Design a binder for this molecule. Sequence first.
Ligand SMILES: OC[C@H]1O[C@H]2C=C[C@H]3O[C@H]4[C@H](O)[C@H]5OCC=CC[C@@H]5O[C@@H]4C[C@@H]3O[C@@H]2C/C=C\[C@@H]1O
Lengths: 210, 206
Amino acid sequence: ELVMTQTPAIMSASPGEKVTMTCSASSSVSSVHWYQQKSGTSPKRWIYDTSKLPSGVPGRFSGSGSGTSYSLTISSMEAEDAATYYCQQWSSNPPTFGAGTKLEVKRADAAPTVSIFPPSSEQLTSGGASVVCFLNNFYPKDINVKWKIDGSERQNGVLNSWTDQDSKDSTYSMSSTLTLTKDEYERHNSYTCEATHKTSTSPIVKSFNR
Amino acid sequence: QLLESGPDLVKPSQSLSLTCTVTGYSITSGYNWHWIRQFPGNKLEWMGYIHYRGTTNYNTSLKSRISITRDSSKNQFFLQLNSVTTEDTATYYCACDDFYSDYWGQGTIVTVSSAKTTPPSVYPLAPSMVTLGCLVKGYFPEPVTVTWNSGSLSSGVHTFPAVLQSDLYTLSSSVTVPSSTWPSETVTCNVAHPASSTKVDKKIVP
Ligand SMILES: OC[C@H]1O[C@H]2C=C[C@H]3O[C@H]4[C@H](O)[C@H]5OCC=CC[C@@H]5O[C@@H]4C[C@@H]3O[C@@H]2C/C=C\[C@@H]1O
């Protein structure tokens, strides 16, 4: 149960930048381990026994520390270093892990490609009706979506999901699903997906008429 | 080298059992073989390990409920976690290390819930480049796997994290291809839900 606080919780860097993250323990620990984890894959030891590099780990990585204050440093950031880093201590059982530092890689801004989709026939047949909207490959990761049916905003029945930074183009994506009963759907004509992003003052809109 | 296998879903108060099949190296030759889990939220926790000499070392907070054994003849080791609850829901990985190096499996997702296993409904999302989609909803538990054209279409694909609501999950996946390839050629999302033994191929027609 000893607690490792990792800082910052989230951070971004352009390739080439020096990167530093800290691991501060609530109690004395004699050492720590660092793990790198990229979206969709298992954790992997990146630094062991606080200053040591396992084979295959790039030398731009280094770790140092003592007592209750540890840190991991990247001399020169590369796009392939984007991932979440966890520190772990094994001085006491349980060998507690930190909550992690999510290192993201920055790139040029990019507006989202927005696509809307009416409910399918198979679903309508089941008494259900979902309208789907995709906001793909945008950057920064901050974005909003708003549903409008015949002009007025709709808030209930909306489920949103966000992907982690893309590994090839470093963009983010979002999916918004609006579900209504089949009869509520057929009581209206215009369905709109509105996306507000940094790359544009006025929101992007896509829509269809029933 | 190592692959986890076991129940997709367990009910509370039951015992959870998992197997790690190791190939390429003998679990009796060296390394410590662990079981490590990650709860939704990305919080990691080492559960314990079985030394290559047959010896054990557990996480003190799980000591009374856990048991790690092995079958040297089949070169696999196991995890048993008694009296589980909705807290135990996590992605479980088996791994091995010798301090200087470590190796991990792919991890297997285990959900502890008394909710009803439900097959998913797969709806096609039709509308230079065109975006298509696939809405997978009304299922339980996680996970589901989604591929496009049996996996031949990989880039230009975005599969979004499922969202839970009222004990049912909803997930979507988009694929972006040239207008030259669609509707000209066929695009199909392949959906699998091992927990209900469901496999669906939904062709995306205009
Ligand atoms: O009984 C002494 C000490 O036992 C612990 C000893 C070592 C630790 O070994 C760690 C592994 O190197 C590491 O391998 C690879 C990947 C992920 C995690 C795994 O974590 C292991 C934790 C382990 O801690 C054991 C129990 C903790 C303190 C005990 O006082």
